[PDB]
Amino acid sequence: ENVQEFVLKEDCELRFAAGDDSDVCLELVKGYAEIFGTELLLNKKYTFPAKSRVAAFTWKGATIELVGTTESAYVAESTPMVIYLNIHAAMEEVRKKREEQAKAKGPRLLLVGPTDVGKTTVSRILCNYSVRQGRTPIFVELDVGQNSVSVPGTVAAVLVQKTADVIDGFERNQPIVFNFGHTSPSANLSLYEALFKEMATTLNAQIQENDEAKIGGMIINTCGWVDGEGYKCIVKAASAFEVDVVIVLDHERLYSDLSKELPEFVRLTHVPKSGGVEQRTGQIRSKMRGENVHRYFYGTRANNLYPFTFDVSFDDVTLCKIGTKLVIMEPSADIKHHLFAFSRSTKADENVLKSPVFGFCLVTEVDLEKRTMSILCPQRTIPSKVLVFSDITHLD
Numbered sequence: 001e002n003v004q005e006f007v008l009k010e011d012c013e014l015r016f017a018a019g020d021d022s023d024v025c026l027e028l029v030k031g032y033a034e035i036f037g038t039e040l041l042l043n044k045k046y047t048f049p050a051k052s053r054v055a056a057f058t059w060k061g062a063t064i065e066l067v068g069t070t071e072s073a074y075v076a077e078s079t080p081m082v083i084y085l086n087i088h089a090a091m092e093e094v095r096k097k098r099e100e101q102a103k104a105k106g107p108r109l110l111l112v113g114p115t116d117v118g119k120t121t122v123s124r125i126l127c128n129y130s131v132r133q134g135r136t137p138i139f140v141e142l143d144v145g146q147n148s149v150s151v152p153g154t155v156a157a158v159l160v161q162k163t164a165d166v167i168d169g170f171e172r173n174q175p176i177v178f179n180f181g182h183t184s185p186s187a188n189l190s191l192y193e194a195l196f197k198e199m200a201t202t203l204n205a206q207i208q209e210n211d212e213a214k215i216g217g218m219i220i221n222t223c224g225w226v227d228g229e230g231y232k233c234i235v236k237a238a239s240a241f242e243v244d245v246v247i248v249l250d251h252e253r254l255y256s257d258l259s260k261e262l263p264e265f266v267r268l269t270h271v272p273k274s275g276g277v278e279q280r281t282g283q284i285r286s287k288m289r290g291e292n293v294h295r296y297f298y299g300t301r302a303n304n305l306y307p308f309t310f311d312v313s314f315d316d317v318t319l320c321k322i323g324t325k326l327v328i329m330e331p332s333a334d335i336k337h338h339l340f341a342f343s344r345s346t347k348a349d350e351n352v353l354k355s356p357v358f359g360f361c362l363v364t365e366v367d368l369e370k371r372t373m374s375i376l377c378p379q380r381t382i383p384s385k386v387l388v389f390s391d392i393t394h395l396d
Protein backbone atom coordinates (compact mmCIF):
# COMPACT_ATOMS: atom_id res chain seq x y z
CA GLU A 1 0.00 0.00 0.00
CA ASN A 2 2.78 2.50 0.96
CA VAL A 3 5.06 3.24 -2.01
CA GLN A 4 8.74 4.16 -2.25
CA GLU A 5 10.49 5.26 -5.45
CA PHE A 6 14.27 5.21 -5.97
CA VAL A 7 16.60 6.57 -8.65
CA LEU A 8 19.84 4.57 -8.80
CA LYS A 9 22.85 6.13 -10.57
CA GLU A 10 25.19 3.76 -12.37
CA ASP A 11 27.12 1.44 -10.04
CA CYS A 12 24.66 2.00 -7.12
CA GLU A 13 22.49 -0.49 -5.24
CA LEU A 14 19.19 -0.24 -3.42
CA ARG A 15 19.36 -2.17 -0.15
CA PHE A 16 16.23 -2.90 1.82
CA ALA A 17 14.62 -5.20 4.33
CA ALA A 18 10.92 -6.07 4.29
CA GLY A 19 9.11 -5.38 7.55
CA ASP A 20 8.67 -8.03 10.23
CA ASP A 21 4.95 -8.27 9.46
CA SER A 22 4.59 -7.66 5.68
CA ASP A 23 5.75 -8.48 2.15
CA VAL A 24 7.63 -5.99 -0.01
CA CYS A 25 7.07 -5.98 -3.76
CA LEU A 26 9.90 -4.70 -5.97
CA GLU A 27 9.50 -3.49 -9.55
CA LEU A 28 12.14 -2.24 -12.00
CA VAL A 29 10.39 0.55 -13.95
CA LYS A 30 13.29 2.01 -15.98
CA GLY A 31 16.74 0.77 -17.01
CA TYR A 32 18.53 -2.44 -16.03
CA ALA A 33 19.27 -4.05 -12.68
CA GLU A 34 20.17 -7.37 -11.10
CA ILE A 35 19.86 -8.97 -7.68
CA PHE A 36 22.98 -10.93 -6.69
CA GLY A 37 23.79 -11.54 -10.34
CA THR A 38 20.34 -12.39 -11.72
CA GLU A 39 18.91 -9.84 -14.14
CA LEU A 40 15.55 -8.27 -13.27
CA LEU A 41 12.90 -8.09 -15.99
CA LEU A 42 11.44 -4.63 -16.69
CA ASN A 43 8.08 -4.11 -14.92
CA LYS A 44 7.86 -7.60 -13.37
CA LYS A 45 6.63 -7.50 -9.79
CA TYR A 46 8.94 -9.47 -7.47
CA THR A 47 7.21 -10.16 -4.13
CA PHE A 48 9.67 -10.65 -1.27
CA PRO A 49 8.46 -12.03 2.07
CA ALA A 50 8.91 -10.50 5.57
CA LYS A 51 12.51 -10.30 6.93
CA SER A 52 13.90 -10.54 3.36
CA ARG A 53 17.21 -8.67 2.94
CA VAL A 54 17.85 -7.64 -0.65
CA ALA A 55 20.27 -5.68 -2.81
CA ALA A 56 19.43 -4.63 -6.34
CA PHE A 57 22.40 -3.27 -8.30
CA THR A 58 22.70 -1.55 -11.62
CA TRP A 59 25.66 -1.07 -13.93
CA LYS A 60 24.15 1.72 -16.11
CA GLY A 61 21.35 3.16 -13.89
CA ALA A 62 17.79 2.37 -12.85
CA THR A 63 14.51 3.53 -11.33
CA ILE A 64 12.92 1.08 -8.91
CA GLU A 65 9.59 1.00 -7.04
CA LEU A 66 8.95 -0.72 -3.69
CA VAL A 67 5.35 -1.38 -2.63
CA GLY A 68 5.01 -2.33 1.06
CA THR A 69 6.39 -1.59 4.53
CA THR A 70 10.18 -1.75 4.76
CA GLU A 71 12.28 -1.76 7.92
CA SER A 72 15.07 -0.05 5.98
CA ALA A 73 15.65 1.09 2.37
CA TYR A 74 18.53 3.13 0.92
CA VAL A 75 20.73 3.53 -2.15
CA ALA A 76 24.46 2.76 -1.60
CA GLU A 77 26.95 4.30 -4.06
CA SER A 78 30.22 2.53 -3.39
CA THR A 79 30.03 -1.26 -3.57
CA PRO A 80 32.67 -3.89 -4.51
CA MET A 81 30.55 -5.09 -7.43
CA VAL A 82 33.23 -4.13 -9.91
CA ILE A 83 35.75 -6.25 -7.97
CA TYR A 84 33.36 -9.20 -8.03
CA LEU A 85 32.81 -8.69 -11.80
CA ASN A 86 36.59 -8.62 -12.48
CA ILE A 87 36.96 -11.96 -10.65
CA HIS A 88 34.42 -13.44 -13.10
CA ALA A 89 36.19 -11.80 -16.09
CA ALA A 90 39.56 -13.21 -15.04
CA MET A 91 38.01 -16.63 -14.49
CA GLU A 92 36.48 -16.60 -18.01
CA GLU A 93 39.90 -15.56 -19.35
CA VAL A 94 41.49 -18.71 -17.90
CA ARG A 95 38.74 -20.79 -19.58
CA LYS A 96 39.44 -19.35 -23.04
CA LYS A 97 43.20 -19.72 -22.52
CA ARG A 98 42.77 -23.41 -21.73
CA GLU A 99 40.24 -23.95 -24.53
CA GLU A 100 42.72 -22.47 -27.01
CA GLN A 101 45.50 -24.69 -25.64
CA ALA A 102 43.35 -27.81 -26.15
CA LYS A 103 39.36 -31.25 -23.08
CA ALA A 104 39.90 -27.95 -21.26
CA LYS A 105 39.61 -28.03 -17.45
CA GLY A 106 37.79 -24.97 -16.11
CA PRO A 107 39.24 -22.83 -13.33
CA ARG A 108 38.39 -23.60 -9.72
CA LEU A 109 37.77 -20.95 -7.15
CA LEU A 110 37.63 -21.11 -3.35
CA LEU A 111 35.82 -18.36 -1.42
CA VAL A 112 37.06 -17.98 2.20
CA GLY A 113 36.72 -15.55 5.11
CA PRO A 114 34.91 -15.34 8.41
CA THR A 115 31.15 -15.29 9.18
CA ASP A 116 29.02 -12.67 7.37
CA VAL A 117 31.55 -11.34 4.86
CA GLY A 118 29.35 -12.30 1.91
CA LYS A 119 30.99 -15.58 0.76
CA THR A 120 27.61 -17.14 -0.14
CA THR A 121 26.40 -13.98 -1.86
CA VAL A 122 29.63 -13.60 -3.86
CA SER A 123 29.46 -17.31 -4.79
CA ARG A 124 25.93 -16.64 -6.07
CA ILE A 125 26.99 -13.60 -8.08
CA LEU A 126 29.89 -15.50 -9.64
CA CYS A 127 27.72 -18.55 -10.51
CA ASN A 128 25.14 -16.29 -12.15
CA TYR A 129 27.74 -14.34 -14.10
CA SER A 130 29.21 -17.63 -15.37
CA VAL A 131 25.76 -18.81 -16.53
CA ARG A 132 25.13 -15.45 -18.27
CA GLN A 133 28.48 -15.98 -20.06
CA GLY A 134 27.04 -19.26 -21.38
CA ARG A 135 28.98 -21.52 -19.00
CA THR A 136 27.77 -24.26 -16.67
CA PRO A 137 29.90 -24.12 -13.54
CA ILE A 138 29.68 -26.58 -10.66
CA PHE A 139 28.72 -24.92 -7.39
CA VAL A 140 30.25 -26.68 -4.38
CA GLU A 141 28.80 -26.05 -0.95
CA LEU A 142 31.01 -27.02 2.00
CA ASP A 143 29.10 -25.05 4.64
CA VAL A 144 27.34 -27.69 6.72
CA GLY A 145 25.69 -24.93 8.80
CA GLN A 146 24.39 -22.37 6.29
CA ASN A 147 23.83 -24.53 3.22
CA SER A 148 22.30 -23.22 -0.02
CA VAL A 149 22.18 -26.56 -1.90
CA SER A 150 20.65 -29.13 0.53
CA VAL A 151 19.69 -29.47 4.22
CA PRO A 152 22.12 -28.54 7.02
CA GLY A 153 24.68 -31.18 7.89
CA THR A 154 25.48 -31.78 4.24
CA VAL A 155 28.36 -31.22 1.87
CA ALA A 156 26.88 -30.81 -1.63
CA ALA A 157 27.56 -29.88 -5.27
CA VAL A 158 25.27 -28.90 -8.14
CA LEU A 159 25.77 -28.14 -11.85
CA VAL A 160 24.45 -24.61 -12.35
CA GLN A 161 22.67 -24.20 -15.73
CA LYS A 162 20.25 -21.36 -14.93
CA THR A 163 20.67 -18.08 -13.06
CA ALA A 164 19.30 -18.03 -9.50
CA ASP A 165 15.67 -17.16 -9.07
CA VAL A 166 15.55 -13.60 -7.64
CA ILE A 167 13.28 -14.64 -4.74
CA ASP A 168 14.04 -18.37 -4.28
CA GLY A 169 17.76 -18.75 -5.10
CA PHE A 170 19.16 -21.54 -7.29
CA GLU A 171 17.16 -24.51 -8.62
CA ARG A 172 18.66 -27.64 -7.08
CA ASN A 173 18.88 -29.72 -10.27
CA GLN A 174 19.99 -33.18 -9.10
CA PRO A 175 22.67 -32.27 -6.57
CA ILE A 176 25.38 -34.64 -5.33
CA VAL A 177 24.83 -34.63 -1.60
CA PHE A 178 26.82 -36.19 1.24
CA ASN A 179 25.42 -36.52 4.75
CA PHE A 180 27.88 -35.08 7.24
CA GLY A 181 25.26 -35.00 10.02
CA HIS A 182 26.24 -31.93 12.07
CA THR A 183 25.91 -28.17 11.85
CA SER A 184 29.64 -27.51 12.30
CA PRO A 185 32.75 -29.27 11.02
CA SER A 186 34.21 -29.38 14.57
CA ALA A 187 31.65 -32.01 15.61
CA ASN A 188 33.81 -34.48 13.62
CA LEU A 189 36.58 -32.77 11.70
CA SER A 190 38.16 -35.91 10.18
CA LEU A 191 34.81 -37.10 8.73
CA TYR A 192 34.29 -33.60 7.26
CA GLU A 193 37.66 -33.72 5.55
CA ALA A 194 37.03 -37.27 4.32
CA LEU A 195 33.69 -36.09 2.86
CA PHE A 196 35.02 -33.17 0.85
CA LYS A 197 37.82 -35.43 -0.43
CA GLU A 198 35.18 -37.92 -1.66
CA MET A 199 33.15 -35.03 -3.13
CA ALA A 200 36.26 -33.78 -4.98
CA THR A 201 37.01 -37.29 -6.25
CA THR A 202 33.43 -37.86 -7.44
CA LEU A 203 33.32 -34.51 -9.23
CA ASN A 204 36.65 -35.15 -11.04
CA ALA A 205 35.35 -38.46 -12.42
CA GLN A 206 31.96 -37.01 -13.39
CA ILE A 207 33.37 -33.97 -15.23
CA GLN A 208 35.30 -36.47 -17.39
CA GLU A 209 31.90 -37.55 -18.80
CA ASN A 210 30.57 -33.99 -19.32
CA ASP A 211 32.79 -31.43 -21.12
CA GLU A 212 30.58 -28.42 -20.30
CA ALA A 213 30.77 -29.14 -16.58
CA LYS A 214 34.55 -29.60 -16.97
CA ILE A 215 35.19 -26.19 -18.62
CA GLY A 216 32.55 -24.52 -16.40
CA GLY A 217 34.93 -25.02 -13.49
CA MET A 218 34.01 -24.77 -9.83
CA ILE A 219 32.95 -22.11 -7.39
CA ILE A 220 33.49 -23.44 -3.89
CA ASN A 221 31.81 -21.86 -0.88
CA THR A 222 33.34 -22.54 2.57
CA CYS A 223 32.00 -21.87 6.05
CA GLY A 224 33.17 -18.92 8.16
CA TRP A 225 35.36 -21.06 10.42
CA VAL A 226 38.78 -19.56 9.71
CA ASP A 227 40.53 -19.89 13.09
CA GLY A 228 42.37 -22.84 14.61
CA GLU A 229 41.26 -26.09 12.98
CA GLY A 230 39.07 -24.14 10.55
CA TYR A 231 42.24 -22.79 8.95
CA LYS A 232 43.49 -26.29 8.14
CA CYS A 233 40.10 -27.15 6.61
CA ILE A 234 40.71 -24.27 4.18
CA VAL A 235 44.21 -25.51 3.21
CA LYS A 236 42.96 -29.09 2.77
CA ALA A 237 39.93 -27.90 0.75
CA ALA A 238 42.29 -25.90 -1.52
CA SER A 239 44.43 -29.02 -1.96
CA ALA A 240 41.57 -31.59 -2.39
CA PHE A 241 39.74 -29.56 -5.10
CA GLU A 242 43.05 -28.44 -6.70
CA VAL A 243 41.90 -24.83 -6.74
CA ASP A 244 43.55 -22.27 -9.04
CA VAL A 245 42.22 -19.24 -7.20
CA VAL A 246 41.50 -18.34 -3.56
CA ILE A 247 39.40 -15.26 -2.83
CA VAL A 248 39.72 -14.06 0.74
CA LEU A 249 36.96 -11.71 1.89
CA ASP A 250 37.79 -9.31 4.71
CA HIS A 251 40.52 -11.13 6.60
CA GLU A 252 44.02 -9.78 5.97
CA ARG A 253 45.71 -12.20 8.41
CA LEU A 254 44.05 -15.23 6.72
CA TYR A 255 45.23 -13.78 3.41
CA SER A 256 48.79 -13.37 4.71
CA ASP A 257 48.96 -16.91 6.14
CA LEU A 258 47.45 -18.47 3.00
CA SER A 259 49.91 -16.49 0.83
CA LYS A 260 52.83 -18.15 2.65
CA GLU A 261 51.41 -21.71 2.61
CA LEU A 262 49.47 -22.31 -0.60
CA PRO A 263 51.32 -23.72 -3.61
CA GLU A 264 52.95 -21.07 -5.78
CA PHE A 265 50.61 -21.65 -8.74
CA VAL A 266 47.54 -20.68 -6.67
CA ARG A 267 46.42 -17.10 -7.28
CA LEU A 268 45.23 -15.37 -4.10
CA THR A 269 43.11 -12.21 -4.08
CA HIS A 270 42.04 -10.19 -1.08
CA VAL A 271 38.77 -8.32 -1.53
CA PRO A 272 36.68 -6.34 0.93
CA LYS A 273 33.20 -7.34 2.09
CA SER A 274 30.30 -5.18 0.93
CA GLY A 275 28.91 -2.62 3.35
CA GLY A 276 25.50 -4.24 2.76
CA VAL A 277 26.49 -7.53 4.38
CA GLU A 278 24.64 -7.95 7.65
CA GLN A 279 25.78 -9.72 10.82
CA ARG A 280 23.48 -12.55 11.94
CA THR A 281 23.19 -13.80 15.51
CA GLY A 282 23.17 -17.49 16.44
CA GLN A 283 19.41 -17.24 17.00
CA ILE A 284 18.81 -15.96 13.47
CA ARG A 285 21.17 -18.60 12.03
CA SER A 286 19.28 -21.39 13.82
CA LYS A 287 16.00 -20.01 12.49
CA MET A 288 17.46 -20.02 8.99
CA ARG A 289 18.61 -23.67 9.45
CA GLY A 290 15.00 -24.56 10.36
CA GLU A 291 13.64 -22.73 7.31
CA ASN A 292 16.19 -24.49 5.12
CA VAL A 293 14.89 -27.89 6.39
CA HIS A 294 11.30 -26.71 5.97
CA ARG A 295 12.00 -25.66 2.39
CA TYR A 296 13.58 -29.04 1.56
CA PHE A 297 10.27 -30.79 2.23
CA TYR A 298 7.69 -28.12 1.38
CA GLY A 299 9.51 -25.96 -1.20
CA THR A 300 8.72 -22.26 -1.53
CA ARG A 301 5.82 -19.84 -1.91
CA ALA A 302 6.63 -19.71 -5.64
CA ASN A 303 7.28 -23.47 -6.08
CA ASN A 304 5.41 -25.59 -3.54
CA LEU A 305 6.58 -29.16 -2.96
CA TYR A 306 4.09 -31.70 -1.61
CA PRO A 307 5.76 -34.18 0.75
CA PHE A 308 4.22 -37.45 1.94
CA THR A 309 3.76 -38.56 5.51
CA PHE A 310 3.51 -42.33 6.03
CA ASP A 311 4.52 -45.14 8.35
CA VAL A 312 7.57 -47.38 7.95
CA SER A 313 8.09 -50.70 9.74
CA PHE A 314 11.48 -51.07 11.45
CA ASP A 315 11.67 -54.52 9.83
CA ASP A 316 11.85 -52.82 6.42
CA VAL A 317 14.80 -50.46 7.17
CA THR A 318 18.22 -50.40 8.86
CA LEU A 319 18.95 -47.25 10.90
CA CYS A 320 22.65 -46.44 11.27
CA LYS A 321 24.91 -43.69 12.59
CA ILE A 322 28.41 -42.48 11.66
CA GLY A 323 30.61 -41.97 14.72
CA THR A 324 35.12 -42.97 13.17
CA LYS A 325 32.93 -45.77 11.72
CA LEU A 326 29.38 -47.16 11.14
CA VAL A 327 27.09 -48.25 14.00
CA ILE A 328 23.67 -49.90 13.65
CA MET A 329 20.98 -48.05 15.65
CA GLU A 330 18.08 -49.66 17.44
CA PRO A 331 14.86 -47.73 16.86
CA SER A 332 14.61 -45.42 19.88
CA ALA A 333 12.51 -42.54 21.18
CA ASP A 334 15.49 -40.24 20.55
CA ILE A 335 15.40 -40.52 16.74
CA LYS A 336 12.19 -38.44 16.86
CA HIS A 337 12.47 -35.10 14.96
CA HIS A 338 15.81 -36.13 13.41
CA LEU A 339 16.65 -36.10 9.75
CA PHE A 340 17.80 -39.38 8.22
CA ALA A 341 19.53 -39.60 4.85
CA PHE A 342 18.61 -42.35 2.42
CA SER A 343 22.02 -43.81 1.58
CA ARG A 344 22.86 -44.82 -1.99
CA SER A 345 24.75 -47.76 -0.43
CA THR A 346 22.56 -50.88 -0.65
CA LYS A 347 24.09 -52.45 2.49
CA ALA A 348 24.76 -50.78 5.87
CA ASP A 349 28.55 -51.31 5.73
CA GLU A 350 31.80 -49.38 5.03
CA ASN A 351 30.24 -48.13 1.78
CA VAL A 352 27.81 -45.89 3.72
CA LEU A 353 30.53 -43.53 5.02
CA LYS A 354 31.63 -42.23 1.57
CA SER A 355 28.42 -42.91 -0.41
CA PRO A 356 26.30 -39.95 -1.50
CA VAL A 357 22.64 -39.96 -0.49
CA PHE A 358 19.33 -40.01 -2.39
CA GLY A 359 17.75 -37.42 -0.11
CA PHE A 360 16.31 -37.09 3.40
CA CYS A 361 13.27 -37.75 5.53
CA LEU A 362 12.17 -36.37 8.92
CA VAL A 363 11.05 -38.74 11.67
CA THR A 364 7.85 -37.17 13.05
CA GLU A 365 6.58 -39.98 15.36
CA VAL A 366 7.98 -43.20 16.81
CA ASP A 367 5.64 -46.06 17.76
CA LEU A 368 7.72 -48.57 19.67
CA GLU A 369 5.09 -51.26 20.32
CA LYS A 370 3.90 -51.31 16.65
CA ARG A 371 7.57 -51.08 15.61
CA THR A 372 6.77 -48.25 13.17
CA MET A 373 7.93 -44.69 12.63
CA SER A 374 6.10 -41.89 10.84
CA ILE A 375 8.30 -40.07 8.34
CA LEU A 376 7.93 -36.94 6.22
CA CYS A 377 9.34 -37.83 2.79
CA PRO A 378 9.70 -36.00 -0.56
CA GLN A 379 8.55 -39.17 -2.34
CA ARG A 380 5.87 -41.83 -1.91
CA THR A 381 8.18 -44.74 -1.00
CA ILE A 382 11.64 -44.75 0.54
CA PRO A 383 14.43 -44.60 -2.08
CA SER A 384 16.66 -46.81 0.10
CA LYS A 385 16.33 -49.18 3.06
CA VAL A 386 19.56 -47.81 4.64
CA LEU A 387 18.70 -44.66 6.63
CA VAL A 388 21.66 -42.68 7.98
CA PHE A 389 21.29 -40.58 11.14
CA SER A 390 21.76 -36.84 11.14
CA ASP A 391 22.00 -34.83 14.37
CA ILE A 392 19.95 -32.07 12.70
CA THR A 393 16.49 -31.92 14.25
CA HIS A 394 13.35 -30.09 13.19
CA LEU A 395 10.03 -29.55 14.96
CA ASP A 396 7.24 -29.13 12.38
Ligand SMILES: Nc1ncnc2c1ncn2[C@@H]1O[C@H](COP(=O)(O)OP(=O)(O)O)[C@@H](O)[C@H]1O
Nearest residue numbers: 054055115116117118119120121274276277278
Ligand atom coordinates in the same frame (compact mmCIF):
# COMPACT_ATOMS: atom_id res chain seq x y z
N1 LIG B 1 25.23 -6.28 -0.83
C1 LIG B 1 24.35 -6.72 0.09
N2 LIG B 1 23.26 -6.02 0.42
C2 LIG B 1 22.36 -6.44 1.33
N3 LIG B 1 22.50 -7.61 1.97
C3 LIG B 1 23.55 -8.41 1.73
C4 LIG B 1 24.55 -8.01 0.74
N4 LIG B 1 25.49 -8.97 0.70
C5 LIG B 1 25.11 -9.93 1.58
N5 LIG B 1 23.94 -9.59 2.18
C6 LIG B 1 23.25 -10.36 3.21
O1 LIG B 1 24.18 -10.51 4.30
C7 LIG B 1 24.04 -11.80 4.90
C8 LIG B 1 25.37 -12.54 4.96
O2 LIG B 1 25.79 -12.84 3.64
P1 LIG B 1 26.44 -14.26 3.34
O3 LIG B 1 26.93 -14.21 1.93
O4 LIG B 1 25.40 -15.29 3.71
O5 LIG B 1 27.66 -14.33 4.39
P2 LIG B 1 28.68 -15.57 4.54
O6 LIG B 1 28.31 -16.51 3.41
O7 LIG B 1 30.08 -15.03 4.42
O8 LIG B 1 28.43 -16.13 5.92
C9 LIG B 1 23.02 -12.55 4.07
O9 LIG B 1 21.81 -12.56 4.83
C10 LIG B 1 22.86 -11.76 2.78
O10 LIG B 1 21.52 -11.74 2.27
Ligand code: ALF
Nearest residue numbers: 114115116146224
Ligand atom coordinates in the same frame (compact mmCIF):
# COMPACT_ATOMS: atom_id res chain seq x y z
F1 ALF C 1 28.73 -18.61 5.29
AL1 ALF C 1 28.63 -17.85 6.91
F2 ALF C 1 28.51 -17.06 8.52
F3 ALF C 1 30.39 -17.60 6.94
F4 ALF C 1 26.87 -18.10 6.87
Ligand SMILES: [Mg+2]
Nearest residue numbers: 119120143146
Ligand atom coordinates in the same frame (compact mmCIF):
# COMPACT_ATOMS: atom_id res chain seq x y z
MG1 LIG D 1 28.00 -18.46 3.63
